Amino acid sequence: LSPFELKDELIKIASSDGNRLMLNAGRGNPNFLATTPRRAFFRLGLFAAAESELSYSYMTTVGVGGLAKIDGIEGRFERYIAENRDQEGVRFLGKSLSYVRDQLGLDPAAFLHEMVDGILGCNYPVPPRMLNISEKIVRQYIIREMGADAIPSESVNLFAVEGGTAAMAYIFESLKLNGLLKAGDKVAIGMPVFTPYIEIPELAQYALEEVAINADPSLNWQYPDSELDKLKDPAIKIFFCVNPSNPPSVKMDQRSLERVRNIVAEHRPDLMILTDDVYGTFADDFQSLFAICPENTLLVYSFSKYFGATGWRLGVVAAHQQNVFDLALDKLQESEKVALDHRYRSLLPDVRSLKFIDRLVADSRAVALNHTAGLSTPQQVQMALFSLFALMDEADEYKHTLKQLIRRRETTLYRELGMPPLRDENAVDYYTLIDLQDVTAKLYGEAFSEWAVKQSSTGDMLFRIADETGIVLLPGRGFGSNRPSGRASLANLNEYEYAAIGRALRKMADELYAEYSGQAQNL
Amino acid sequence: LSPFELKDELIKIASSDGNRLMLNAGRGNPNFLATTPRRAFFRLGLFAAAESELSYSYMTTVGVGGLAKIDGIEGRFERYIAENRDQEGVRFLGKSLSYVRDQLGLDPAAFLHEMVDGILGCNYPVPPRMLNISEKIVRQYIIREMGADAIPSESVNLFAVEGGTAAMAYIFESLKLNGLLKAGDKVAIGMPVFTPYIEIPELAQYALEEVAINADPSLNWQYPDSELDKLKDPAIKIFFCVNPSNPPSVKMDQRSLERVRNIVAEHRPDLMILTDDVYGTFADDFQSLFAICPENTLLVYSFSKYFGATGWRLGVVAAHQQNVFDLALDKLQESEKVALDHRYRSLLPDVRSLKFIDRLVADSRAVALNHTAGLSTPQQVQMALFSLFALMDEADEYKHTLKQLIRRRETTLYRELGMPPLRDENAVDYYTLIDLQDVTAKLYGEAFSEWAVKQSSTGDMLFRIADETGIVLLPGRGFGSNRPSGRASLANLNEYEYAAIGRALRKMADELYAEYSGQAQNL
Amino acid sequence: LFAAAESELSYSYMTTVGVGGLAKIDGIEGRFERYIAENRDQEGVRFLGKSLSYV
Amino acid sequence: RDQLGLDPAAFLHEMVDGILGCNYPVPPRMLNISEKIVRQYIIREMGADAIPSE
Ligand SMILES: *Cc1c(COP(=O)(O)O)cnc(C)c1O
Ligand SMILES: *Cc1c(COP(=O)(O)O)cnc(C)c1O
């Protein structure tokens, strides 16, 4: 049948917000979430409300408060912390003050006030790009989880945005407005990638040409040298990539990372790299292209999956202080610079000094509104708390818990399918590939496996499952329609449901085997 | 001296986030805030965290939770409410369930779950435009505070956005992408208005022509018929207006509202009205242009000032089900419709049916990302709580408290300036006009008043104050430089500070009077 | 006392004056069960509890 | 501290040392901050809406 037609139909046999999200946005919404940093947030909120009431000078029963005062805040916070040792979030808050004060060396009072004033949401974000201390806390978390083990923290700047969704919207419009990406420009895209990232560059607002950098199934979905080398083409202005990938769900290996490193150093020092690494924490020793080529990369990191915070809309765009986007802006034609000089005039005197990452902020809200732009303060505070939570968990227990949960769901799913496929060191598996050829092969041998692959189709497979379980899987994309296969997220369902997907597929395979047995036995 | 030059200088003699906000964004950040709905929010958060932990099936000390279950939620919420009657926010939550259940007639379980799942921020907003029940709660609040006492609630749709700041950015880009506003188009602007709203239409992204609709000082800053009539010009595609106004801070009277009503009904049924009414709740019996011409108006309402929530970034764009923006989209050239048919193809089959307010959503995040667009769920939940708070306060006590606070600050400011100017029925006074002519006139008579106005200048006045108090006021704009005058917000400072502005200005006036006395006495 | 509480949950507006609404029959058993369990040390409540069973 | 703009610690100390009644009134005419608080009440209740506090 057809791909962009099978999606429309599937949404029918099985309707659900989850199934629609998977089909409409190619995302698996996590059914788990970090609770400790959230309780810490709500508890910090009860402390901040008390701080606000201490500042309202008149008598009322209405419920009005003033701005929290920074003076003596460490004392009052410590009183609050001591008086509520038996509440989880509270213990967390208290330790987080120590982490910021003792391990990061920041001003403790400043920290508490930013969080307090922050969570009350009674002041416009300042600076608009990101709250001062929250920016330093979050980048510490970013640098660590991206495996950017060589980039000094002071060199990374962050722009807080409402998720990777806002991030991409911002980045594409800014690149276009600053003439760093013009129509007809070639944008290399790591493939396969989910639908959304294929349609923006296809928009008429941009009109970009796509150069596919196809992953190779026989290489466990890594990018082969020959494919990565396609970047040496000087006509390719930007490398758009999701890593760990979606849907293959694997992280680029060392080979692939070094490959790109060389390509940038010896052939393309002008190449712009745009990488979405939301799944990084689900991989084992993840390293981002941002860690490898910091000055050629705009890193888009979302807090959505790891923290089970898709609803909080929390993300950051990271850029190295010295980067190719500012250089390209420097190299624009005087003609163009004058034009930009008039766009960001109301911002600063020397518009030519205005950094790219800051134009992102300016651009996000029609420039003239730059001073009331930025992510809400309560969201930034929750973002910093999520960050502290991961940074303070030295033993990575939360991370181990989630990887163990993923694997438990995988074990349940492949119970009647011949056990889960062999794991690699690049395996992430937030999404898992259910390939009819591999399953039948494990169950009844290579011979049957080959016959089956010709008798069935992805449509057949997905329909059979959607029918018997109500779950709609993602068609397997990336390797010539010659292989019936679908994808499931191990992050959005419960055990018995995976158990049902498997049971449904084992039935399907036994049916094919019965047919195959009856046929060969007619020789 | 100069206006766009005096701003740059003032930011020097006195530096502060408050002074910068007033100068850079023409806004007075409230030093007050609604505490009850915020405590209610944090308390709802502790309840939701418990609901989440009830859904995690394994043993850990890490702090992981699952999705809250809707079944039996009314029972558990009621247990929570009964067990915490002594906490303010809790009492509020409980009553809010009744308001939604008994006065709005919505599903109680649905309500609780939306709030619970909402505050946990573990799911993508759905629908992207706005959470179902939050949309019905907030529009009830909007319709009431806008004085839209004749528009059935079912006819108003809302799009939750991150403040009026995001709203305007969205609306201008959407109008341009859908060809409802093209370059060279005439946009009428209610003046005076703060700087930000003057620079967007001036952007090269848009390139619009401004037709000023000047308010008349002698009319207490209302718009005279002759000025409003300038809208009959068929070349004026959109009327851009802030009401209650900033900086004059008055609400359009009945005359002005009816005037525009007729202009739309008998001459311009195709005119698009874009109104920002954030200050509405500070006026007495406010009525929005949206209440008067619902089908010709896109209402932008912010929760920032009234709730002292500038940091939460909460706002909504309201549109009537049947409106001129969709009609104009219907009237576009087939040529154009085909072009749009390809922009929003991935959204729906019959793109021509896609309503304008929904294109706002689609446009906000590059279309392809429409399904993960929308305001974060926790913000929407806080927005609904703020709304319920105002709706449940039948006696408008919170509102009276804030109007009384405003007036107290005004009384303190004009103590040594001859008492505050006479109040009108259209007076809002979130910002107050300190006019040297009126003050001197009240203090030493009309004669002196006239001599003084020629001896001084706005620069002089603002510098004298900035010097002696550290507070930088807003130059008085709107009536020919012939009148030294500045503006202060009665919402961002404390009593003793207003007391100091006044003391500084009385000194200045006495000095002018001493000179004037010495002169005339030489006849 | 339990009814007083029930009525108060039905008043949808904010006031300190002390006005209640009509008790709702939905979910009444659970709310009553909570009230019984929280006041096992009050004679009257133990009796109320038994009454529900008898009926 | 917020509306009158006086020193909070000084205020608290005057009230605490004051109510303990362990020090002679100083200065004799009236305690420094009490005078400023009370005069703001006086001016207001006597309708002296134009007289400067100081
Ligand atoms: C799930 C997902 C995200 C999350 O989008 P947010 O707007 O950040 O919630 C980002 N990128 C990819 C590839 C995803 O799978
Ligand atoms: C203060 C103000 C607002 C608030 O902007 P938000 O982005 O909604 O915080 C809106 N419009 C005007 C005219 C203002 O004065």
Curated annotation (Swiss-Prot), chain D:
Q: Recount the biotech application.
A: Is highly specific for L-aspartic acid, and so can be used to produce L-alanine and D-aspartic acid from DL-aspartic acid.
Per the record, the domain of life is Bacteria
Q: Where along the chain is L-aspartate bound? A: G5
Quote the function comment for this protein: Bifunctional enzyme that has both L-aspartate decarboxylase and transaminase activity.
Q: What is annotated about its quaternary structure and interactions?
A: Homododecamer.
Family assignment from sequence similarity: Belongs to the class-I pyridoxal-phosphate-dependent aminotransferase family.
The name this protein goes by in its record: Bifunctional aspartate aminotransferase and L-aspartate beta-decarboxylase
Q: Give the residues of the full protein shown.
A: 111 to 164 of 533
